Amino acid sequence: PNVKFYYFPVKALGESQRLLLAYGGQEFEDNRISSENWPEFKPKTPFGQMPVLEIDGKQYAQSTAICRYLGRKYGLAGANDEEAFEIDQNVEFLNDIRASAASVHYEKDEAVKAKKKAELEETKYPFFFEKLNEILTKNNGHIALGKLTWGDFVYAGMYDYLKAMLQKPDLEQKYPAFRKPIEAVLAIPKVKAYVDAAPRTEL
């Protein structure tokens, strides 16, 4: 198929799709649209956002939905409904962590941001980190099924962005399991080759 991927020049929510395309051996145009050029493309997208994946002229939007689609195409979505459910479930948990951290990161009033951060540090984050540690340990370094799944790609693509929003650059010092899905994805030669060749960003 003729495949084009459109996202900002950052990893954040789109990198997981890039990593999955690499995994599946799919050649693609990796179109990294700057903030300055984005307004020209915005009204051409399904929801006025990126990422957008284009396959043979047809557009696919919504990062998690795209990852699940690619996951199924590439054999990373389990063998049956129950296995597929578990990946969905655990990725939805990751999304709760991300949404919580984003509520702090994108707060423009610094006094409000400080209050929110402190609240999450006492009432959500300790629970999230222990739960993530449980999941990664139960699954032998993976997000789900004890083995490589599309959930690991979601995790690996957003991990640096999530750490930035949490303001815990050193998270994996206390929780060494947290680097394991990233190592799993990078151990795949096609994926490592794409990462080596790809533009670097902090988030």
Next chain:
Amino acid sequence: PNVKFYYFPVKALGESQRLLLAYGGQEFEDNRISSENWPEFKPKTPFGQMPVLEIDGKQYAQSTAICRYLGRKYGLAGANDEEAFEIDQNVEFLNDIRASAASVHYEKDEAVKAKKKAELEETKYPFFFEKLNEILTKNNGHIALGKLTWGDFVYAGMYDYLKAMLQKPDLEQKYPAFRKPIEAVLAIPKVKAYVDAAPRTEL
């Protein structure tokens, strides 16, 4: 199967699962756990939250993941990968609306809440409402595929909760399409029977 559903005594994020079980003709224990009793059950759940669906003793958490699972079991997830993708995509869009509204609704500082609300009213909500109107019109009163899907159940279950968070009780006056997925779900006799028999709540 022996099926039990655990959630708070509210519609909010859990009602879509109740509606789907009704659709599929699945008898279930609808266990509405109060805030007062919830701390006893919390550590028995997969992530310290509800909803939780139990099937033959096995627990399933994460509302959207559960809905998609039930959707597939009951023939409401499309006929192929492309159709399934579209439902996922459009439900992920609904989630963006919900997450945005929740950022206002759950703000405890009223001065901050007012600023956030005003910002969303000028910069996100007009776009969300036009996009939702497009989708519902394109799909003949549905969230996806031009026909009944599990996405309609997600929409119908949370609609009153979403309107409460948006502070637009009268939303469907400007946008009459917005009531159509709810009408579609309620036109199914098994679903209407469950709704008639079920406890009522404002959200």
